[PDB]
Amino acid sequence: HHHHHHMVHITLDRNTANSWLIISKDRRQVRMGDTHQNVSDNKERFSNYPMVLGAQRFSSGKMYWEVDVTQKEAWDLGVCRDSVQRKGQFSLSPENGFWTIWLWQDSYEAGTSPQTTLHIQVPPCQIGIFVDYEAGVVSFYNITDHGSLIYTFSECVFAGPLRPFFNVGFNYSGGNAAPLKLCPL
Numbered sequence: 001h002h003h004h005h006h007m008v009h010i011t012l013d014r015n016t017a018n019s020w021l022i023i024s025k026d027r028r029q030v031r032m033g034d035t036h037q038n039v040s041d042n043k044e045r046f047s048n049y050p051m052v053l054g055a056q057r058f059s060s061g062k063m064y065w066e067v068d069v070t071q072k073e074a075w076d077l078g079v080c081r082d083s084v085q086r087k088g089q090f091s092l093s094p095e096n097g098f099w100t101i102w103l104w105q106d107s108y109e110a111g112t113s114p115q116t117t118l119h120i121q122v123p124p125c126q127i128g129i130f131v132d133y134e135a136g137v138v139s140f141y142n143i144t145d146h147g148s149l150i151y152t153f154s155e156c157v158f159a160g161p162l163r164p165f166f167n168v169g170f171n172y173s174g175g176n177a178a179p180l181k182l183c184p185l
C-alpha cells in the first residue's frame with residue numbers, strides 16, 4: 001500500500017476512557033490498570049469494556065495511523081461513529097457504528113455481523129488503519145508482514161464524524177497487560 005503519506009498524529013481522549021485505563025502523559029499509549037484509576041464518572045466513558053477513543057474527529061478525506069499490539073492476547077482496533085453507545089453491553093458491528101478487527105483466543109476476526117475469520121500467516125506486532133471517508137472504506141494492514149492487507153470494509157455508511165477506536169482488552173489471564181501504543185510517523 002501507499003497510504004503512509006496520509007499519516008495523522010492520533011492522541012487518546014482521557015475523558016472517553018473506561019475508568020480502569022491508564023493513558024500516558026503524551027496521550028499515545030494506553031493500558032489496563034489493576035484497579036479503578038480514581039477519575040470521576042461522565043457520560044462519555046465506556047462503562048463495560050476497556051475502551052477509549054482518539055481525540056481527533058474525521059468527516060472528510062483520507063487518514064492513516066499505526067498501532068503497536070506487541071505481546072497482547074486480546075484487543076479491538078478500528079474507527080467508530082462519534083455517537084456510539086458508551087454504557088451497557090453491545091456488539092462491535094457496522095450497524096452499531098463500529099468498523100473494527102480484533103484478536104481473541106489465538107484467532108483474528110473482522111467485526112462484521114456475524115464476525116468474519118481473518119487469514120493472517122504472520123501475527124502482527126503493528127497494525128496500519130486507513131480510512132477514506134468519501135469512498136466509504138476502512139482498511140487494515142499488517143506492518144510486520146511488509147504492509148500486507150488484512151481486511152477492507154467497503155460500502156461503509158459512516159453516518160457521522162468518525163473517531164479512532166481502541167480496546168486494550170481484559171487481563172483475566174495475566175498475559176494481556178501490555179499497552180496499545182500509537183507508533184511514530
Ligand SMILES: CC(=O)Nc1cc2c(cc1C)OCO2
Pocket residue numbers: 049050089090091092167169170
Ligand atoms: C456482547 C459482547 O461480547 N461484547 C463485548 C465484550 C467484551 C468486549 C467488547 C465487547 C463489545 O471487551 C471484552 O469483553
